[PDB]
Amino acid sequence: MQILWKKYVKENFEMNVDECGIEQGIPGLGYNYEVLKNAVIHYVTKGYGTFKFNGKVYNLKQGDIFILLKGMQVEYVASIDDPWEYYWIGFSGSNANEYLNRTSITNSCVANCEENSKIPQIILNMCEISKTYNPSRSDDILLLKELYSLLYALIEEFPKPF
Amino acid sequence: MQILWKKYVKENFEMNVDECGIEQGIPGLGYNYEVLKNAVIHYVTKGYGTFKFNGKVYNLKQGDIFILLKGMQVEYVASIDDPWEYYWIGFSGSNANEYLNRTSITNSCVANCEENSKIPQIILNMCEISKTYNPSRSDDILLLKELYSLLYALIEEFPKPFE
Ligand SMILES: OC[C@H]1O[C@@H](O[C@H]2[C@H](O)[C@@H](O)[C@H](O)O[C@@H]2CO)[C@H](O)[C@@H](O)[C@H]1O
Ligand SMILES: OC[C@H]1O[C@@H](O[C@H]2[C@H](O)[C@@H](O)[C@H](O)O[C@@H]2CO)[C@H](O)[C@@H](O)[C@H]1O
Ligand SMILES: [Cl-]
Ligand SMILES: [Hg+2]
Ligand SMILES: [Hg+2]
Ligand SMILES: [Hg+2]
Ligand SMILES: [Hg+2]
Ligand SMILES: [Hg+2]
Ligand SMILES: [Hg+2]
Ligand SMILES: [Hg+2]
Ligand SMILES: [Hg+2]
Ligand SMILES: [Hg+2]
């Protein structure tokens, strides 16, 4: 089960950080469900797993990304021999959804980032903020700044044609 | 008329970049008016000028910041001898105003940043983006990222005492 799962209030409608999490997968455990949340990006930090959507089964490993979007019927499962760990960021809002439409990643909902990608670092930085989250110290501003950085980095690394 | 004056559409209501500008003052000249815009932060990059608000007269120079807020009756004028250049960023939105009210400088509306302040660099970066603004290249995302960075840096350097 998950070592970290932070849920935030839905207070913003243009851009909102909904949740984040870290899960070390267990062999023989996966999830099979219709996505209820707006958008959830997963980054694979260790091991191996499968992501299945619309009859396509992807074998993913460290460096891979998969994104869940509202209404998708998905199945994602840790490998038996070497189960993955993933980090995730769930987010919503009218700006978020417009920016997701500017990246090719929402075509297949899977990507592989380069070893020098800013995407992993932003997700990890957002998770660190989540651990000691304090809006009185304006951690709410920092999280939203990082979410804008994350969506910019997805468009930069996985652009749609101009 | 100005080195830069980019005006943006009011498309966001929580956080919006309204405008960006760079102006080289003409000696002895400036502006005297009631502020109509939501919030406009100015950073003095060169020279000297005067900012007058609510019976106070500030003699500002490079490193100084002044902020214009809706309803303020202001006058700001370049010095006769060595007229200032300033950069500005106008912004609006419900969350923008909440964040601005976590700073100590919404009454005085004038500050001096430390020489290692992130504030000057963010404003400069926003002006550079504004010069070749292209939403097709997602410059709109970059400007909002920088506005969050700017409000975070203002709160870090000018924190309202929290209880
Ligand atoms: O949201 C990412 C998170 O999803 C969990 O699965 C949940 C999902 O969050 C929830 O909306 C739905 O009702 O039930 C699912 C459990 O079946 C995963 O457990 C977690 O690892 C992340 O992938
Ligand atoms: O907004 C900062 C910008 O203000 C200009 O002054 C304008 C102002 O923007 C406008 O709202 C008002 O109706 O007219 C003013 C001119 O009287 C300054 O010219 C410019 O240098 C910036 O300070
Ligand atoms: Cl100020
Ligand atoms: Hg897809
Ligand atoms: Hg990667
Ligand atoms: Hg987070
Ligand atoms: Hg995270
Ligand atoms: Hg997290
Ligand atoms: Hg700008
Ligand atoms: Hg003021
Ligand atoms: Hg300064
Ligand atoms: Hg600017």
TrEMBL record, chain B:
Name of the featured protein: Probable transcriptional regulator
Full protein segment contained here: 1 to 163 of 279
A Gene Ontology molecular function term of the record: DNA-binding transcription factor activity
Swiss-Prot/TrEMBL keywords: DNA-binding, Transcription, Transcription regulation
Organism, as annotated: Clostridium perfringens (strain 13 / Type A)
Transmembrane domains' residue ranges: none
Organism classification: Bacteria, Bacillati, Bacillota, Clostridia, Eubacteriales
